[PDB]
């Protein structure tokens, strides 16, 4: 058996790396955490440091408020009984206000007032985390690709929880916090809109989601196939093409008649992925606002 480079045969550790400094405020980095031989068979052994900052602590606080808001309600539902709480975990659910309360904040605390509290904290937590991805790229002089990419995820989610609910006139359209119940909302949404397989955005969403799996598999496997010539050092292959970038391009050119470049592939990648939630958020947003039935619309418009 020749060697595959899925798992390292020998790890090496030296002094903890503290990172690059550029324009970062170093008062805000933690210090390194422990070192994980386990992780190190596959990835890097070093945990931390992490950057806190005011935004990061804002964000992290809210996301726990959101998670504890949902959790106390789950204990309520279980009648504070630890054995029930376990047994029934995927069944509990924090539901939004009924249609009648519309877009208002009046809804009793127990019938959705709590849902909004949790949602409020969620909003705060996501957007501030988004400010974070941008700021940490800025401190380092790096491009804003991560923050723009993450915005495309944020799209689908804004659409589900905030925008579509607002355009339909009620919070009851929004998604509930619960394991099985959010699965049910999803099925339900499809049935009630004449089946999402008829939504042409939904289908593009799939092409892309599936696309991501095909692509990352191509790429990951390509990079591992040429890592015997240093292929994973992608930034230096960009600056100064090696026989790794060459063998890679040519594998594809010979297989399928065109290829990428070591920089280009990363552009194929960032787009394949972000279009999943891009088209998705659109597909979802049109549903019930402009189109009541995808089958139907599918019949006049094709």
């Amino acid at each position: 058996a020749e060697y595959q480079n899925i798992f390292s045969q020998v790890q090496v550790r030296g002094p903890a790396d503290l990172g690059m400094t550029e324009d970062v405020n170093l008062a805000n980095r933690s210090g390194v955490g422990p070192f994980s031989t386990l992780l190190g068979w596959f990835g890097n052994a070093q945990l931390g440091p992490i950057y806190l900052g005011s935004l990061g602590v804002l964000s992290l606080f809210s996301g726990l408020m959101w998670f504890f808001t949902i959790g106390i309600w789950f204990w309520y539902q279980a009648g504070w009984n630890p054995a029930v709480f376990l047994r029934d975990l995927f069944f509990f659910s924090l539901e939004p206000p009924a249609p009648e309360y519309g877009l208002s904040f009046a809804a009793p605390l127990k019938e959705g007032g709590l849902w909004l509290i949790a949602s409020f904290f969620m909003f705060v937590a996501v957007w501030s985390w988004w400010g974070r991805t941008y700021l940490r790229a800025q401190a380092l002089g790096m491009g804003k690709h991560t923050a723009w990419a993450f915005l495309s995820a944020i799209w689908l989610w804004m659409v589900l929880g905030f925008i579509r609910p607002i355009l339909m006139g009620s919070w009851s359209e929004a998604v509930p916090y619960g394991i099985f119940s959010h699965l049910d909302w999803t099925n339900n949404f499809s049935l009630v809109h004449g089946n999402l397989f008829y939504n042409p955005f939904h289908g593009l969403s799939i092409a892309f989601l599936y696309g991501s799996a095909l692509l990352f598999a191509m790429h990951g496997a390509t990079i591992l196939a040429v890592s015997r010539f240093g292929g994973e050092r992608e930034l230096e292959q960009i600056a100064d093409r090696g026989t790794a970038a060459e063998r890679a391009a040519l594998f594809w050119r010979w297989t399928m008649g065109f290829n990428a470049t070591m920089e280009g592939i990363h552009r194929w990648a960032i787009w394949m992925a972000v279009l999943v939630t891009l088209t998705g958020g659109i597909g979802i947003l049109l549903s019930g606002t402009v189109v009541d039935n995808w089958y139907v619309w599918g019949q006049n418009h094709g």
Binding site: Q4, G19, M20, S30, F42, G43, N44, G48, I50, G79, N81, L86, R87, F91, F92, R136, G141, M142, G143, K144, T146, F150, F180, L183, D184, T186, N187, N195, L209, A213, F216, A217, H219, G220, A221, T222, L224, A225, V226, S227, R228, E232, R233, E234, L235, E246, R247, A248, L250, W254, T255, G257, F258, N259, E263, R267, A269, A273, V274, V276
Partner: protein
Amino acid sequence: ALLSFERKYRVPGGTLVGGNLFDFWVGPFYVGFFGVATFFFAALGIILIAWSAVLQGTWNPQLISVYPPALEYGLGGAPLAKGGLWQIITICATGAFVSWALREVEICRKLGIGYHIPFAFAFAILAYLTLVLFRPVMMGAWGYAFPYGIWTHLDWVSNTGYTYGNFHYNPAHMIAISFFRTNALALALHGALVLSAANPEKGKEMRTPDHEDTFFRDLVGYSIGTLGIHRLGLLLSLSAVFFSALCMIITGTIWFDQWVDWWQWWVKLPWWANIPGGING
């Protein structure tokens, strides 16, 4: 016809079958025994399909469809117009795919690289063979397989899943979906990271793999590393498809009731079954 750097690579050797017989290119395309094998199977299958277009009286991409033999025919042959075509087309598809994979191996041998690519492709091929071959056989009939046409194969997805209620509850379909999503998240992050390092703020100098580790650390307090993330992508993806196939091969065969009902094993456990309150008491 050649990339600026290509010619030093276009040497003889690496073929699996044929010696030097098909050791050449057509434009960009390497051929090989298996470039020929995949052509024959591929072109046959296309013919056999355009033939199927006649025997149902449409010449239209959105309508052309080819169904397995009906459940009645068992795991045995079938008149061309009533499911035979599909059987031979499937034979063709398999031939084309596996041939495409072994051709990929031949390109590997010539280029001095690892076999990682065709190895990954064989997962996708095994998903497909799970739908049209391994599940049908375990289920007693070709008719249980999906049909080859653009909108009609979706109909089959919907019918197959609703046979078990909301298919969401298949717990291997859950694992599956987790890998697809995770993969997508990882594909966006890698992409975006490599690019934000190669394409820094205006006028600055391109960043380095250490910046890349730094950016992650700052953000979430870990970084997998540049070997790591290519190991990861490949794992998330192959795992999505592994679980995809597993969730289907167990459906209609070891479990055939309503998937949501499988989740009762947990609820009906001695140590909490009968305590009152919650959702199930």
